[PDB]
Amino acid sequence: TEFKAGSAKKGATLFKTRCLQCHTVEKGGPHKVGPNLHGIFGRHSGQAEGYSYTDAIIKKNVLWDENNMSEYLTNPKKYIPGTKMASGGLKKEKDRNDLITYLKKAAE
Amino acid sequence: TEFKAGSAKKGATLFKTRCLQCHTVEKGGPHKVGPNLHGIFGRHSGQAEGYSYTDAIIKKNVLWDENNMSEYLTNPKKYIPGTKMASGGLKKEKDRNDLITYLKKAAE
Numbered sequence: 086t087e088f089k090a091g092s093a094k095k096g097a098t099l100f101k102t103r104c105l106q107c108h109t110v111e112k113g114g115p116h117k118v119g120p121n122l123h124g125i126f127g128r129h130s131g132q133a134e135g136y137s138y139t140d141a142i143i144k145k146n147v148l149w150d151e152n153n154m155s156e157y158l159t160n161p162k163k164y165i166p167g168t169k170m171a172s173g174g175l176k177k178e179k180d181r182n183d184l185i186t187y188l189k190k191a192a193e
Numbered sequence: 194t195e196f197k198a199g200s201a202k203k204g205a206t207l208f209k210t211r212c213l214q215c216h217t218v219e220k221g222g223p224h225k226v227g228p229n230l231h232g233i234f235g236r237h238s239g240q241a242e243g244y245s246y247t248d249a250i251i252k253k254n255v256l257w258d259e260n261n262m263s264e265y266l267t268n269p270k271k272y273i274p275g276t277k278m279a280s281g282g283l284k285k286e287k288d289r290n291d292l293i294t295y296l297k298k299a300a301e
């Protein structure tokens with residue numbers, strides 16, 4: 086990979102401070118500004134049901150792997166021009182690594 | 194993605210004619226020349242237990258997604274220099290697509 090396992094604990098707190106505002110990760114969690122992320126890994130972009138995605142994300146049709154998720158998080162709009170995810174991104178690979186480690190584990 | 198779903202039926206027969214010689218895909222299937230492929234998607238390269246992999250594959254530490262699997266199949270040795278998988282590859286994207294479609298489904 087080009088993703089290195091980080092601290093799932095560190096990633097949990099990054100999630101809460103950077104992602105929670107718009108998303109849930111638990112199975113059965115609701116869509117909010119952003120879609121619930123349970124089971125995101127291996128799923129393609131813009132496929133959660135009952136969520137209204139941008140045309141851009143559906144069509145980018147990104148396959149979510151720890152690798153892909155990394156570029157996305159780096160700079161969402163640069164990666165999927167047109168996305169309405171209003172996040173400036175996680176510029177440090179160390180933060181991304183911790184977050185993805187946490188997300189790999191909690192969205193399963 | 195850059196992978197398009199094909200014919201799972203077509204992929205089953207490509208598997209049997211090109212992959213079966215060295216691999217099994219069923220859960221509980223044994224390692225043969227090549228490792229059993231059950232649950233390969235989302236797993237990193239060189240991690241099936243009880244199989245003796247090349248140094249190269251372990252270290253390539255490729256994360257298996259439909260996308261990755263595609264490049265691999267295209268030309269194994271060009272993608273993982275040092276691998277002992279003795280396959281010349283699947284040059285047509287249409288064949289790859291059918292195979293991966295089948296593999297996505299059978300290795301789950």
Ligand code: HEC
Nearest residue numbers: 103104107118119130131132138139142168169170171172
């Ligand atoms: C609101 C201010 C958000 C914050 C903070 C984060 N995300 Fe987000 N996300 C948001 C929206 C509005 C959308 C949908 C975009 C669209 O163009 O329709 C998303 C989407 C995602 C995705 C893609 C989901 C898919 O089903 O394809 C992922 C993987 C994602 N968001 C993850 C994520 C993470 C891990 C965040 C914290 C670093 C995060 N987002 C912040 C809104 C918002």
Ligand code: HEC
Nearest residue numbers: 211212215226227238239240246247250276277278279280
């Ligand atoms: C014997 C002549 C093989 C044929 C035909 C195919 N594969 Fe293979 N595969 C083979 C070996 C000896 C190995 C291990 C390589 C090493 O360097 O140790 C592999 C490995 C794979 C992998 C990687 C597995 C992992 O656990 O990381 C995959 C995804 C794979 N093989 C798939 C595959 C497919 C789909 C094939 C048909 C087109 C196929 N292989 C042919 C041996 C042989």
